[PDB]
Subunit: 116 residues, 4 copies
Amino acid sequence: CPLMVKVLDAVRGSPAINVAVHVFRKAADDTWEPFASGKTSESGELHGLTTEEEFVEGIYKVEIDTKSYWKALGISPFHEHAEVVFTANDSGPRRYTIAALLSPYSYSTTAVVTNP
Amino acid sequence: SKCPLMVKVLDAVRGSPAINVAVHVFRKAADDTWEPFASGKTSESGELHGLTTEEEFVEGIYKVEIDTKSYWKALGISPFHEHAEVVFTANDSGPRRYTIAALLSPYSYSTTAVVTNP
Amino acid sequence: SKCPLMVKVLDAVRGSPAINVAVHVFRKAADDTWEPFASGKTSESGELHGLTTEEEFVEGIYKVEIDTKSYWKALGISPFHEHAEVVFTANDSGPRRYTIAALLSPYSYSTTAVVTNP
Amino acid sequence: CPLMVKVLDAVRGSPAINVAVHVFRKAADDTWEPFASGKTSESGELHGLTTEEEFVEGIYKVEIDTKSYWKALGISPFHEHAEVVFTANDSGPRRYTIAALLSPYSYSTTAVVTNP
Ligand SMILES: O=C(O)Cc1cc(I)c(Oc2cc(I)c(O)c(I)c2)c(I)c1
Ligand SMILES: O=C(O)Cc1cc(I)c(Oc2cc(I)c(O)c(I)c2)c(I)c1
């Protein structure tokens, strides 16, 4: 698994469950092309998004649908979603973990990159 | 200050405001595309004021894009993100003033919104 | 403002400054214990100014304690932390002004320091 | 494992390795009593700090020696250490994960609490 996502809830102190995540890749014509999608599990993690074979060099955008997550909890959040845009594998294949901590009016994201 | 929208950027590596950071603001148009709205560069205090006025700032979806990549390269540091973006809906129902704050690190960034009405 | 030390607290759940938050500042004494130095409550803008002066603020180790627990209980929310603490060394070598900022959530808090000299 | 710690480095985008962690418990006389200590591993995690049997109700302090971590990297950090103080198991036994993201002039910490 070359691309994984981990989301946590800072209001409840638990993993953010069933959060929709859409992954896009910058196409040749400079437009966002659908690449993969999923929902986080019980532990707030999302795996199996792609393979080393399909995860080629490029600029990717990871969109986390925070808005839907909060509303389903009766909270009216500030952000429409959280976006993480980055260039991947431009110096050979690597493994990426995109982590996100969510709050109604705030979120922070970090990336952990390891060489296989 | 009657500025409806403000931006504040900080540097978590050097513990100082993030200066000369390019900031571009966009608004969602009917045809579902992003059209330029305002832009500028953070000052010596890492702030960016006077991006718009109450009259022009109507309800709708806005995107605030911060060129963090160029900020880090200028310091000789390899960043992870292409840029940082904050997408939100501005409603007159809620308070009046919007402050978008961002704390930057090479592989991480956090952002918060302060919505207060005077 | 010549205030050498400033504190800013924000609420990430309601997107507003954290008001009436108790803040206690301590300094490390020779016998390795913490002795009261200054204290106060954040204002309507979540800020706390005039905690000390240049004369009294000498080099040494300081601890800034924020009573976050009472803040959350007042909102009817069960917090995780007893309080938030920021322990740092103040040196004349480095810049002059210190701003300690904290973003609060029930199960999480982040803090950053802005050190700038005018 | 009822108490685990996870630390990440936001400057290098990797787990924070060999970070010293000391855990204290508030004693009857209102003083901090040593409870456990360790260093994070290759993955930036610290496990095996205590057992469900020894981890009784009380106020605990988790101290992460960030200062030493940064200096060993040639960086002069702002904080002496990072402190997480909390009341644990006051409503029955729970599992705690204390997570921390570190930067030279900043750090954020969150807690994940799950019921066994
Ligand atoms: O997230 C962290 O790790 C710590 C942190 C704390 C605060 I509080 C922040 O927000 C502001 C907002 C205003 I308005 C300020 O003037 C200042 I100084 C900081 C940010 I971004 C980041
Ligand atoms: O930002 C804060 O206030 C605190 C914080 C600390 C960490 I470290 C985080 O990242 C991870 C990454 C992995 I992989 C985990 O398994 C877990 I648990 C948390 C997040 I999001 C938020």
